[PDB]
Every structure is written in structure tokens, then in C-alpha cells.
Amino acid sequence: SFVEMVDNLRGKSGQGYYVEMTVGSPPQTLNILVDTGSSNFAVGAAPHPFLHRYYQRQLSSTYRDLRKGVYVPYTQGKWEGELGTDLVSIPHGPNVTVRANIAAITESDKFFINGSNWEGILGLAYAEIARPDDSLEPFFDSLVKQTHVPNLFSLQLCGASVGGSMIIGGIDHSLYTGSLWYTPIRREWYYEVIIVRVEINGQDLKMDCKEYNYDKSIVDSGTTNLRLPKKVFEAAVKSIKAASSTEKFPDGFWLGEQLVCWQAGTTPWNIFPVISLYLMGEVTNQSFRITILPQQYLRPVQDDCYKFAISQSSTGTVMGAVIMEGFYVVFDRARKRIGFAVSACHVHDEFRTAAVEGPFVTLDMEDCGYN
Numbered sequence: 001s002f003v004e005m006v007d008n009l010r011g012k013s014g015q016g017y018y019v020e021m022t023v024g025s026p027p028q029t030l031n032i033l034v035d036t037g038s039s040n041f042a043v044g045a046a047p048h049p050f051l052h053r054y055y056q057r058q059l060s061s062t063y064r065d066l067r068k069g070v071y072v073p074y075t076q077g078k079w080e081g082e083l084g085t086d087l088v089s090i091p092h093g094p095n096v097t098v099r100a101n102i103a104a105i106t107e108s109d110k111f112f113i114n115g116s117n118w119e120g121i122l123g124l125a126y127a128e129i130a131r132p133d134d135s136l137e138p139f140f141d142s143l144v145k146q147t148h149v150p151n152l153f154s155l156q157l158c159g160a161s162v163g164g165s166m167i168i169g170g171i172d173h174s175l176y177t178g179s180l181w182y183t184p185i186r187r188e189w190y191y192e193v194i195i196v197r198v199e200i201n202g203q204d205l206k207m208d209c210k211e212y213n214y215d216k217s218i219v220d221s222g223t224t225n226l227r228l229p230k231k232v233f234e235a236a237v238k239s240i241k242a243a244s245s246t247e248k249f250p251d252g253f254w255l256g257e258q259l260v261c262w263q264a265g266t267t268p269w270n271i272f273p274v275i276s277l278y279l280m281g282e283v284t285n286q287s288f289r290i291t292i293l294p295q296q297y298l299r300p301v302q303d304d305c306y307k308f309a310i311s312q313s314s315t316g317t318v319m320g321a322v323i324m325e326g327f328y329v330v331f332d333r334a335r336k337r338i339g340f341a342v343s344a345c346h347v348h349d350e351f352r353t354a355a356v357e358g359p360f361v362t363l364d365m366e367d368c369g370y371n
């Protein structure tokens with residue numbers, strides 16, 4: 001059953017997690033970035049100095065041109081290419097083969113990354129943000145539609161070169177401890193959610209909860225950092241400076257420009273505080289919280305070096321890998337909800353741990369959303 005999928009993700013820190021797939025007949029093999037923050041399936045389809053493999057569609061008897069072009073801009077980076085369809089499968093995935101839309105990438109800028117080991121991207125989000133428009137069915141919808149695979153997947157992202165598991169079609173109990181807690185998908189476009197309270201070492205940040213969701217808050221495996229709206233980010237960096245003022249670090253540290261280090265095994269984890277996000281629950285006035293350690297928001301790179309992986313955004317809250325690596329995360333599309341549980345590959349600290357706890361009580365959670 002789901003064991004076949006356990007450990008099917010690999011990666012380099014800060015360059016995403018990818019899963020092996022094949023496209024066309026005879027099977028061509030590629031490593032595909034797993035991206036809950038977008039919704040196209042796209043693949044290098046012509047030489048590029050950072051690809052060492054690409055989809056040669058001349059060689060596939062199942063290739064079908066759709067004779068349209070397509071374009072997709074990400075946060076930094078973008079590509080254009082040629083749309084068609086072909087047959088796709090996931091070797092360490094369910095035992096099945098589908099006809100999926102596929103963008104053949106013909107040009108790009110700052111998309112592909114020097115020796116990342118992946119050659120395309122699997123957008124796992126919803127049609128609403130697909131390019132060219134919402135009518136280009138994304139991979140997972142084609143998968144669900146053509147097979148009997150249930151409409152959910154789960155992700156266990158391990159930090160520290162990295163690995164994890166993408167379980168397609170269900171939940172694997174070996175990948176987590178404690179219970180799952182769920183938050184409603186507010187709208188099916190990105191995996192959007194509502195954060196209703198933020199605390200840093202015990203203390204509310206005390207803003208209107210709307211500022212947490214200003215624009216939107218999304219769960220995005222293709223983003224590295226915890227990204228926060230300006231006002232919130234400012235507020236969270238004050239409080240993380242104050243919690244840790246035992247030592248002072250440059251400014252390029254807090255802007256993520258420069259690293260910080262300590263003799264191997266000396267990192268003063270205890271001076272850095274836990275962050276808690278409280279998320280909208282399943283029941284009336286009910287929330288739960290996820291807590292993350294400094295071992296998550298200080299990304300590593302004879303002394304131990306780290307980058308501050310909380311960054312400013314003008315485009316909403318992004319719960320990226322920093323946040324996901326704490327937990328097993330269940331994208332339960334069928335019930336419109338996202339599950340969090342403590343991960344089995346949690347980055348454990350001697351005196352504290354990453355947690356998912358509830359219930360808590362929070363009034364007017366719907367009003368924390370932005371319109």
C-alpha cells in the first residue's frame with residue numbers, strides 16, 4: 001500500500017524536494033520538483049546549461065501537441081513553452097498511468113538551478129491558478145479523474161541534502177506522531193488557510209489577525225522560507241531580536257543576506273524562541289497551533305553556519321518548507337482541509353519540541369481572512 005511511496009523525495013537544501021516520474025512511451029525519466037504552490041506540470045524540453053536531461057518528445061509515440069503556448073512566472077524565475085499531452089507515471093508512487101497536460105519548457109530565466117538534480121515541476125495546486133487559464137487541468141485532477149486514487153496526498157518534508165515522502169492517495173501512520181489537526185482550505189486556488197494568532201516565545205504579537213492573512217496565507221512546498229507580510233515580519237523580528245539579545249548579529253543576518261556560525265555543536269538554540277501559528281479549526285470558534293523551533297527557521301548551509309529563513313513578503317504569508325519540515329502535512333482535497341501532525345523525522349532538540357496542539361478557542365476566525 002503506502003510503503004511503496006515512503007522515502008520517494010530527495011533534494012538539496014533550499015532548492016526544493018523532487019520525486020521521480022516518467023513521461024511518454026518508451027518511459028523517459030526525470031526528477032520533478034513537488035510544488036503545492038502552483039498548478040502546472042512543466043518539464044525542460046530542450047538544452048539548458050543547468051539541465052543534464054530533458055524531455056525529448058520526438059521519441060514518444062504517445063506525444064500529442066496541443067499547438068498552444070504557455071507562460072508561468074514564479075516569485076523569482078519563469079519559463080515559457082509548448083503545451084501538449086503524454087503519458088505519465090510515478091515509479092515510487094501508485095501503480096498507474098495517466099494522460100496529463102504537460103508544458104514543454106523552451107525558454108526560462110532563473111528557474112532551473114545549478115546542479116539541483118531536477119528537470120521540471122509538478123504544480124499540485126488547483127486549476128484556478130493554472131496558466132494559461134483555469135481550463136488547463138492540472139496533474140492531480142487528471143490523476144484522480146482517470147484512476148481510483150483518492151483525492152488527497154500528504155507530504156513529509158525532512159530537513160537536515162534532504163529527503164522525505166509524498167504519499168499519494170492517503171495518510172501513512174508511520175510518518176507521524178500524535179494526532180492530526182485540520183484547517184479548512186479557504187478557497188481552492190493556492191492551498192489557502194487562515195492564521196488567527198501568532199505568538200513568539202509565549203507572547204501574542206497583538207495585531208489585527210487580518211494582517212497575518214494580508215493578501216492570503218498559503219501552504220507552499222516550493223517556497224523555502226516562512227514568508228510574512230511586512231508589518232508582521234517587522235513585528236516578528238523585533239521580538240526575535242529581543243528574545244535573543246544575549247548576542248547581537250549583523251543586519252544582513254535578519255535580511256537573510258549573511259550567515260552566522262558557531263564552533264560545531266555550540267549553537268545556542270535556547271536563546272532563539274519558538275514561534276507558534278494558530279490556525280482556523282474545524283469546529284465553531286476552535287483553533288489549534290503549530291509550534292516551530294529555531295532549528296527550523298535557521299536553515300543550515302568545523303563550525304556550523306545558518307541562514308535566517310524568515311523573510312519579508314508583500315504578497316501574503318507563505319508557509320514554506322521551513323514550516324512544513326516540522327510536520328506531516330495532509331492535503332485532503334476531498335474534505336477541503338489541510339492536516340498537520342508532528343513529523344516522525346522531526347528535528348528534535350534536547351529541551352523543547354515542535355508541536356501541534358489544541359483545541360484552543362478563538363472568536364471571529366472568518367474575519368481574520370482578507371477580502
Ligand SMILES: CCc1ccc2c(c1)[C@@H](NC[C@@H](O)[C@@H]1Cc3cccc(c3)CCCCCCCC(=O)N1)CC1(CCC1)O2
Pocket residue numbers: 014015016033035037038039072073074075076077111129220222223224315316318
Ligand atoms: C502560479 C505561480 C506562482 C506565482 C507566484 C507565486 C507562487 C506561484 C507561489 N508558489 C511559489 C512556488 O510555485 C515556486 C516554485 C519553484 C520555482 C522554481 C524553483 C523552485 C521552486 C525551487 C526553490 C527556489 C527558491 C524559492 C523560489 C520561490 C518560488 O517562486 N517557488 C508563492 C507566491 C504566492 C504568494 C507568493 O508567489
